[PDB]
Amino acid sequence: MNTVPFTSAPIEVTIGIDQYSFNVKENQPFHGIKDIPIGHVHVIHFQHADNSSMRYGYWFDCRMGNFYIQYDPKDGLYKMMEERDGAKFENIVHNFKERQMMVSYPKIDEDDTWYNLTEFVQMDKIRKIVRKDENQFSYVDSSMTTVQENELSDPAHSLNYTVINFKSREAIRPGHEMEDFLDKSYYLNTVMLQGIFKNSSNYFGELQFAFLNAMFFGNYGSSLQWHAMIELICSSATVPKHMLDKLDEILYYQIKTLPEQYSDILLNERVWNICLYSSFQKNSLHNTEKIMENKYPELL
Amino acid sequence: GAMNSSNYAELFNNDIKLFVDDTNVYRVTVHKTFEGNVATKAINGCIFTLNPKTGHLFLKIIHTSVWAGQKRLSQLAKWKTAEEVSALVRSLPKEEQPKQIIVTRKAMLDPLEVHMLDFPNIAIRPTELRLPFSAAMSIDKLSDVVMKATEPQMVLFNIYDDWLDRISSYTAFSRLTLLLRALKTNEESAKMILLSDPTITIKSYHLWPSFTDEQWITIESQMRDLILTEYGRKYNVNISALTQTEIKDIILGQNIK
Numbered sequence: 141m142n143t144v145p146f147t148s149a150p151i152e153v154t155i156g157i158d159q160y161s162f163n164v165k166e167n168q169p170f171h172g173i174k175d176i177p178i179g180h181v182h183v184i185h186f187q188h189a190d191n192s193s194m195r196y197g198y199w200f201d202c203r204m205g206n207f208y209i210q211y212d213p214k215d216g217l218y219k220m221m222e223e224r225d226g227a228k229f230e231n232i233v234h235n236f237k238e239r240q241m242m243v244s245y246p247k248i249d250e251d252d253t254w255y256n257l258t259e260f261v262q263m264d265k266i267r268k269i270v271r272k273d274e275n276q277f278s279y280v281d282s283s284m285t286t287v288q289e290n291e292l293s294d295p296a297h298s299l300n301y302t303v304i305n306f307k308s309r310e311a312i313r314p315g316h317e318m319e320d321f322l323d324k325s326y327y328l329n330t331v332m333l334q335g336i337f338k339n340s341s342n343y344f345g346e347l348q349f350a351f352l353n354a355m356f357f358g359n360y361g362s363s364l365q366w367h368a369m370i371e372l373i374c375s376s377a378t379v380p381k382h383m384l385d386k387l388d389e390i391l392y393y394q395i396k397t398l399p400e401q402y403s404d405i406l407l408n409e410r411v412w413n414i415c416l417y418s419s420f421q422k423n424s425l426h427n428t429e430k431i432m433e434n435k436y437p438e439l440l
Numbered sequence: 441g442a443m444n445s446s447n448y449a450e451l452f453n454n455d456i457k458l459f460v461d462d463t464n465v466y467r468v469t470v471h472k473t474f475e476g477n478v479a480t481k482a483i484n485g486c487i488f489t490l491n492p493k494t495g496h497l498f499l500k501i502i503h504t505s506v507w508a509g510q511k512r513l514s515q516l517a518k519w520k521t522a523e524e525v526s527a528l529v530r531s532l533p534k535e536e537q538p539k540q541i542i543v544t545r546k547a548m549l550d551p552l553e554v555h556m557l558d559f560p561n562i563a564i565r566p567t568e569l570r571l572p573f574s575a576a577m578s579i580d581k582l583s584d585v586v587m588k589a590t591e592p593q594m595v596l597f598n599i600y601d602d603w604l605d606r607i608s609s610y611t612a613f614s615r616l617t618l619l620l621r622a623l624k625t626n627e628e629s630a631k632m633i634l635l636s637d638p639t640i641t642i643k644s645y646h647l648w649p650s651f652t653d654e655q656w657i658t659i660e661s662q663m664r665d666l667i668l669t670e671y672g673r674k675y676n677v678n679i680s681a682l683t684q685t686e687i688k689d690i691i692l693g694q695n696i697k
């Protein structure tokens with residue numbers, strides 16, 4: 141019962157809303173998306189019909205303000221904007237709903253897929269990874285590089301994921317070189333969980349956000365981060381039972397949702413083989429192991 | 441990248457570099473037990489750390505005590521190697537520290553990289569050369585200091601003796617690798633070639649005999665003969681029938697991965 145109206149749809153485009161998508165024709169009487177479930181972050185994403193390199197979107201939470209989409213013919217994209225006049229916004233939404241010019245967020249009652257993919261994802265953590273403090277919503281696209289990718293250029297348009305590097309002084313205590321390289325528990329539990337993330341929920345929110353940006357935008361840096369955060373856990377001998385059980389749930393829903401036809405670009409053979417069959421946690425991810433073996437046995 | 445045939449002259453330039461060979465760090469004898477199971481017994485080993493330009497050899501003796509009560513010894517041996525190389529680099533004055541460390545086995549790359557994180561400007565490289573540094577323990581004076589050791593010890597040698605007074609580093613390294621390859625291929629025959637003429641001795645302060653320039657040519661020829669003879673014996677090849685190119689290609693081919 142929250143709504144993102146569109147001023148118009150002047151260019152033919154595939155519009156995603158979370159895991160859903162639909163095609164809009166050039167100058168189609170399309171005026172947005174209604175019945176968006178309150179209580180979760182959402183992502184509205186675009187791929188232009190005439191140029192599939194234009195792949196971009198906005199993370200938002202309808203609890204934080206009244207958002208709409210307007211096409212900018214100068215910058216050639218669908219922009220998210222915030223409407224500060226509540227009564228104007230309500231009156232616009234009411235007119236478009238009465239004229240039935242909005243698509244309804246097509247949630248099946250039984251279907252927890254989106255909650256399962258965003259359980260730990262919070263808009264305030266998104267806004268620290270994607271820095272544009274003047275907006276309450278966050279723009280992401282296919283080409284944005286990560287702070288890590290930029291080290292190995294524009295720092296204002298980067299994805300500020302937590303840097304994970306197994307062969308770094310941060311990961312390896314002087315005097316514990318073999319110990320820390322073969323068992324990443326110090327790096328996971330002391331440096332990352334206690335030190336940087338403060339708790340497993342923030343760590344899982346960043347992992348889930350990385351996966352979603354990888355899947356929805358084909359953002360390569362995000363895919364790297366998702367796999368790095370999985371490998372950091374799987375490569376740790378000492379991980380709390382609750383975190384292992386939660387990771388198995390997280391990864392199961394991610395593998396379930398991944399389109400079969402993108403499995404070859406979105407899944408890293410080395411990391412998955414290592415995590416499921418060689419790592420400390422090879423026997424801790426039963427649900428993920430079963431869906432991977434049944435859906436993607438060619439990768440394994 | 442990788443040190444190979446294409447960049448071979450780089451070994452003899454004025455950038456300090458070390459080869460590290462870990463093949464003699466963890467050494468065992470394998471034997472039957474009373475109950476007819478099999479057991480290993482470790483023997484003293486060594487890290488072979490060589491400057492190919494100067495001949496300086498940093499032989500770190502690995503005493504069997506370092507294995508006591510440890511598991512996964514073949515994995516530990518690589519990390520112990522890296523730990524000791526990183527201790528040697530920290531022990532050297534800054535102007536003596538290597539710019540590159542070339543490991544003979546690619547399994548040494550991660551252990552050495554991780555121990556050398558404090559030295560981001562020291563390059564850790566593999567090599568496409570098949571070097572015969574495992575045969576270091578065929579050099580009698582090296583084998584003797586390793587086996588006599590009762591505790592961890594570092595011993596310093598010049599593995600070229602005084603050759604650099606007369607020959608270039610390139611030639612010295614070529615001579616060393618030919619001698620070590622011959623000793624690796626047929627130790628007894630190689631030692632007989634080196635130790636045959638009793639009138640040519642090993643100086644107290646040297647590893648190899650005091651050959652004249654002409655005698656070194658004869659010895660080098662006898663070593664290449666040994667290697668080719670053993671290649672014929674191994675593969676059942678009539679070597680008398682081979683051409684000069686075929687022969688050069690066979691002796692070279694063995695020192696290339």
Ligand SMILES: CCN(CCC(=O)O)C(=O)c1cccs1
Binds near residue numbers: 446614618
């Ligand atoms: C015998 C000399 N030698 C072969 C063995 C060695 O010295 O490493 C060489 O000049 C080359 C090795 C690899 C490319 S050229």
